[PDB]
Design a protein around this ligand. Structure first.
Ligand SMILES: OC[C@H]1O[C@H](O)[C@H](O)[C@@H](O)[C@@H]1O
Ligand SMILES: OC[C@H]1O[C@H](O)[C@H](O)[C@@H](O)[C@@H]1O
Ligand SMILES: [Ca+2]
Ligand SMILES: [Ca+2]
Ligand SMILES: [Mg+2]
Ligand SMILES: [Mg+2]
Ligand SMILES: [Mg+2]
Ligand SMILES: [Mg+2]
Ligand SMILES: [Mg+2]
Lengths: 565, 569
C-alpha cells in the first residue's frame, strides 16, 4: 500500500481562535493560547489545523471582515506569535492552513478607502454602480438592482464620498472585490505568496459561490434583478425574496479557482518540500460543488471543496436510509481520483450533538473517521460540545443583529456554536482566567469538558483518540467501502482490504432499540471484537460479538474488528 | 460449468408493458382503440419478449377522464368492447403464456355509478359511501355558502362540489365527476374486495391500483368537527381555485391509507392460498417522497403491502438535464430505500407524462431501454417506448384531456395536457400509422409516424425494436435474473452497470448520457475482462453487435450505449 500525500487522509481540525484558548485574561482567544495547546492536536491524533481568520479586522463579522490581509489581528497577537505558532506546530509534525475570504474586504481596508476616493489603480477594485430613479418618490434613490445581502437588506450600500453604491453580498462593512479586475486577481496571488513564504501549509478560502455577479456589459449597462422566489413569507429586504441567478454560482468563478490552483502547483514545483494545498468553501448544489475539484475539460481546482452534507442534509430527523443515501452523494458525484472529506460542523452552524442528538456523538465521530478520505473536526466535536445558551443581550453575531429581534434572533444567530472551548471544570471551563469571556461559556461545561473525558474510562475524547489511531491502518487508508441500511433505524459501513483486518461500523441512528441480522453485513465473520462503542453501549472495547442477532439501543454505535477478507 | 439457478416467481422479473387501449389498435375504424384490436396484436407482446401486460382502465366509464371515471367496476366500456371480448383476450393471452393485469382507481367512482346515485339519494348502505360534508358555518354572511375547507382538486377548482339534491358537498380530489369514496367505511373496503374477487375469478393475474396517496383525508373528529384547511403554499402565482395554492397535508399521504393497502395484500394472499396456480399480484401507484413510497411495500412492524409500488424516478427526477452522476444517484435511491426482500421496478413513462425520448433526447432511446432491461427486478415499458415514439403535437382544438380543459386555455394548455403521450401507436406507414383504417382518430397521429413505426424497425438492419427484442431475450440469461449489480459513474458523461454471476457470462452497460463525446478507461469497470463482445449497441453506434472490444480505452458518442458480453467471474 503506497504512502499517500499528507492531505489525502489527514484528520483536519478547525480552530475558532477567538474561542479556543485565552492566554492573557481578556476573555478573547489568542495565538499564544493556541501555541500553549498545540500538544492537544498530537494527543487527539489531528494531522492538520486550519484557523478562522486571524488577519487585521474591525471584528464586525469576527475576522471575516479583513482590513489588512498581510498582518495579524492585535487581539489574537503579533506576526511574531504567528511565526512561533507555525514553528512549534511544524516541530510537532502538524500542518497549518490559513483561512481568508477572497470575496470581500473590510470597508476599513486601504483597498476600500482608496477605491472609494477613486485613487488611481483602485477605482475598479470593488463593484460600484449608479442609482435608479424612484417612480413613487423621486427624492429616494433606488439601488442598482433588487439583490439581497446574506445578512438581510439590500446588497447595495450608498457611499456619500463616491456618490455611487458598492456591492456587499455579506455585511455593509464587507465590500465585494471585482474579480473581473486583473489587479484584484494579482492581489490575491500577492496575499497567497506572502503567507506561503512565511511557511503556511496552504489555505482554506471562503464564500467562493459569491465571487462573480452578472456583468452589466451583458445586460445593456444594468445590474439585472435576481428573479423573485414568489413566496409571500419574504419581504423585499429578507433573504429568500430572490433566487440568486445573477449573484451566485456563476461559471466564471471556477476559472479564478483554477488559476489559484495553477499558481499553487507552480509554487509547490519551485519550492519543493511537502505539498501546499487549497481547500474551498461553497454551499451549493452537488454538481456546482464538484466544479471546485476541476471540470471535464481537464481544469484542476481546489485539492477539495468542503463536503457540508452532514450539516445541510442530515439531522435528528434523518433515518438510517437517509444517512446512507446522503453519504453516497459525495461518493457518487466526486471525480475519479478525488479526495472525499466529511464536515460535521463549523462556527456558522449548530453544533453536531444539537443538530443530531446527545446519544449520537460517538456514532457521528466514527462515520467521520471510518469513511474514506479526510475527516474534518470542528473545535468541540472531539468532546461532544453542545450549543451554548446566548441571550439576546449577549448576542454579537451581525447575522442575528441584522435579521433578528429578541423573539427571533435564535433562528439566525451563529453564536451558540462559538462559545468558549471546554478545557476543564475551572473558571470559564479553563478557556480563560477571566469570567469576562467574549461569549458566555455554555451552562454544561462541568459535565462536558476535555479534562473530565481524559480521566474517565470511557469518553467521547477517548473514542476520538481510538478512531484517529485506527486511521493509521491500511484498511482505512486504502480499503474498499460498503455501506447499506439494515433497517430504517440501523446502517453498516465496512472497510475491507484483502489480508488486512476488516472494520465494521454499526449505528442505530433512531430513538428506539433495533435488532439486526449481522449475516446481512458483507465481509463480517463472527466472532468479531468491539474496537470502539458509544459511551452508553453495554459493550466494552474487547467485548466479543458471537451471535448473528444484535440488539442496538437508541444512538448505539459499534466499530467491530473482524477477520481479513 | 455454469451453475443451475432456481427460476424466479413470474412477477419478480417480468417485462411489464402498459397498454393504453384507446390508442393501441382500432379494429373497427371508429378511430378508438379497442379489445379486438389488442387481441389481434397479442403476438406483438411475444415478439417483443413482454411477459405481462397491464391495461389502462377498460371498465364502463363516461370517459370524462378516459376510463379513470368508472361507472361500473364489473363490466367493459362499450367503445372497447364486451365482457366476451375481455374473456377472449384473457384466454388468448394465457394461451400465448402472457400474464394480464387490470388497472382501476380505488380512490373514486363516476357520478354516473350506481354507488353515487344511491349515495346522493341517501339510500340504505350508500349514504356514507362517499365523503359528504355540510357547508362551513358563515356566521358573518349567513346567506353566503362556504365549502367545508379550502381543498383544491388535482384538475383545478375546489375539491368540494355542492349537491342540490343532498344539500351537502361531496369531495372530488380529481374531476367534479370523480367522487372520492369514504375509505373509513367498512362497506367501501368490502366493495373493493368484491371487485378484485370478481376479476380474479374471471382469471386476471393481478391489479394495478391508481391514485393511492389520495385515499384518506383528515377526519373532522380530529379537527373540532370541521374538515381542516390545507396549509397555504404562499406562492404569489396561484389563487384559491388553482392547484399549487395549498400543500396537501390533510389530503395526501395520510398514514391510514397504508392500512387499506396492507388489507388488500392480506385479501390477495388469502385468495392465492385458496386458488393456487401462479401468484396473483397487486402493484400500487403513488407519486410521493421516497419514505412515503416505500410504505407501500410494508412497514417495519411487519405489515406487507403491494408486491411493489411503481418507481417513477426516471419520470420525476431525471431528464435531458441529467448527467451520468444524476443517473447513478437516482438509480441508487430505490436501491437504498427499498426494504429487505423488496422487488425493484423501473418506469420510464406512462399516459400521464411526456414520452421517454421527449423527456430525454431522441439519441438516448436505446440506452434508456438498456437501463430498464439490465437493472435488477422488473422492467416496465409504456406503449411506444419499444419503438422510441415521441410526444405527438396536439392543438388546443384537438385537446380532450380534462386536466388541460379545466386548468388551461389556448396559451397555457400545453403545460397540463397529457394528450401528447396518448397519440395512436405507430404500427406502420399506412393511414393513421396502421392504428386505424380511418384518417379520423380520437387524438391526432404524431407527424413523425413515417420515420418512427414498428414495421419499419422490423425491416431495417438496426432499430429501437430489434434492440428491445435483444434486451428482453437477454433477461432470460441467469446473469440478469439472478446476478449481482454494480453501478458507478466513470465521468460526468458516462456510467456503467455490471451484472455478474460466478460461472455465468458478465454483461456491462456503458452509457454516455451527455451531449458530448467521452473517453473512459474500461480497466475501472468491475468484472470486465477484455476482449469483450458488443451484444447490443445504440442505432447510431460505430459498433455493431459482434464487434470485439480489445482496447481498455473506449470513446463513446453523445447518447451512445453498449451492452458488452464478457467472460464469467
Ligand atoms: O465572510 C462571510 C462568511 O464567510 C464564511 O462563510 C464564514 O465562515 C462566515 O462566518 C462569514 O460570515
Ligand atoms: O383517476 C385519476 C388519475 O389516476 C391515475 O393517476 C391515472 O393514471 C390518471 O390518468 C388519472 O387522471
Ligand atoms: Ca463577489
Ligand atoms: Ca380519497
Ligand atoms: Mg486573550
Ligand atoms: Mg469556460
Ligand atoms: Mg375501435
Ligand atoms: Mg393574494
Ligand atoms: Mg401532470
Amino acid at each position: 500500500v503506497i504512502q499517500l500525500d499528507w492531505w489525502k487522509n489527514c484528520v483536519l481540525y478547525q480552530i475558532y481562535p477567538r474561542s479556543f484558548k485565552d492566554s492573557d485574561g481578556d476573555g478573547i482567544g489568542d495565538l499564544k493560547g493556541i501555541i500553549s495547546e498545540l500538544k492537544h492536536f498530537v494527543d487527539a491524533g489531528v494531522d492538520a489545523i486550519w484557523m478562522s481568520p486571524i488577519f487585521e479586522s474591525p471584528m464586525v463579522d469576527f475576522g471575516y471582515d479583513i482590513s489588512n490581509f498581510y498582518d495579524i489581528h492585535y487581539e489574537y497577537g503579533t506576526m511574531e506569535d504567528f511565526e512561533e505558532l507555525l514553528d512549534k506546530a511544524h516541530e510537532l509534525g502538524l500542518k497549518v492552513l490559513l483561512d481568508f475570504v477572497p470575496n470581500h474586504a473590510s470597508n476599513e481596508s486601504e483597498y476600500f478607502i482608496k477605491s472609494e476616493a477613486r485613487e488611481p489603480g483602485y477605482e475598479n477594485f470593488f463593484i460600484w454602480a449608479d442609482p435608479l430613479p424612484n417612480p413613487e418618490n423621486p427624492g429616494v434613490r433606488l439601488p442598482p438592482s433588487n439583490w439581497v445581502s446574506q445578512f438581510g437588506g439590500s446588497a447595495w450600500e450608498w457611499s456619500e464620498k463616491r456618490q455611487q453604491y458598492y456591492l456587499h453580498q455579506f455585511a455593509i462593512q464587507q465590500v465585494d472585490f471585482d474579480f473581473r479586475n486583473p489587479a484584484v486577481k494579482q492581489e490575491m496571488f500577492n496575499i497567497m505568496k506572502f503567507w506561503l513564504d512565511k511557511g503556511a501549509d496552504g489555505f482554506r478560502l471562503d464564500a467562493l459561490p459569491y465571487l462573480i455577479e452578472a456583468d452589466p456589459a451583458d445586460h445593456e449597462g444594468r445590474y439585472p434583478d435576481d428573479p423573485l422566489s414568489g413566496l409571500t413569507q419574504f419581504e423585499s429586504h429578507q433573504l429568500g425574496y430572490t433566487i440568486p441567478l445573477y449573484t451566485k454560482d456563476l461559471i466564471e468563478l471556477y476559472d479564478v479557482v483554477y488559476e489559484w490552483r495553477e499558481f499553487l502547483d507552480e509554487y509547490n514545483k519551485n519550492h519543493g518540500g511537502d505539498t501546499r494545498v487549497v481547500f474551498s468553501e461553497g454551499y451549493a448544489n452537488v454538481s456546482m460543488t464538484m466544479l471546485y475539484y476541476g471540470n471535464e475539460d481537464g481544469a484542476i481546482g481546489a485539492h477539495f471543496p468542503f463536503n457540508f452534507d452532514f450539516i445541510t442534509d442530515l439531522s435528528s430527523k434523518s433515518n438510517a436510509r437517509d444517512f446512507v443515501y446522503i453519504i453516497l452523494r459525495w461518493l457518487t458525484y466526486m471525480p475519479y481520483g478525488g479526495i472525499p472529506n466529511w464536515v460535521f460542523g463549523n462556527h456558522d452552524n449548530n453544533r453536531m450533538p444539537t443538530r443530531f442528538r446527545h446519544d449520537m456523538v460517538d456514532g457521528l465521530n466514527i462515520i467521520n473517521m471510518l469513511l474514506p478520505g479526510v475527516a474534518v473536526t470542528y473545535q468541540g466535536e472531539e468532546i461532544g460540545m453542545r450549543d451554548g445558551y446566548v441571550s439576546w443581550e449577549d448576542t454579537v453575531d451581525i447575522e442575528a443583529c441584522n435579521r433578528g429581534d429578541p423573539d427571533t434572533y435564535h433562528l439566525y444567530s451563529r453564536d451558540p456554536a462559538r462559545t468558549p472551548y471546554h478545557w476543564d471544570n475551572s473558571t470559564s471551563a479553563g478557556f480563560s482566567t477571566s469570567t469576562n469571556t467574549w461569549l458566555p461559556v455554555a451552562e454544561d461545561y462541568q459535565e462536558i469538558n476535555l479534562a473530565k473525558q481524559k480521566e474517565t474510562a470511557r469518553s467521547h475524547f477517548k473514542n476520538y483518540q481510538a478512531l484517529t489511531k485506527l486511521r493509521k491502518q491500511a484498511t482505512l487508508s486504502h480499503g474498499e467501502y460498503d455501506i447499506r441500511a439494515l433497517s430504517d433505524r440501523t446502517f453498516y459501513l465496512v472497510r475491507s482490504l484483502p489480508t488486512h483486518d476488516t472494520y465494521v461500523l454499526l449505528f442505530n441512528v433512531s430513538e428506539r432499540r433495533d435488532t439486526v441480522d449481522l449475516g446481512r453485513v458483507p465481509h463480517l465473520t463472527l466472532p468479531a471484537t468491539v474496537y470502539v462503542s458509544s459511551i452508553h453501549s453495554a459493550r466494552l472495547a474487547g467485548h466479543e460479538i458471537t451471535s448473528s442477532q444484535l440488539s442496538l439501543e437508541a444512538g448505539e454505535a459499534l466499530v467491530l474488528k473482524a477477520q481479513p477478507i
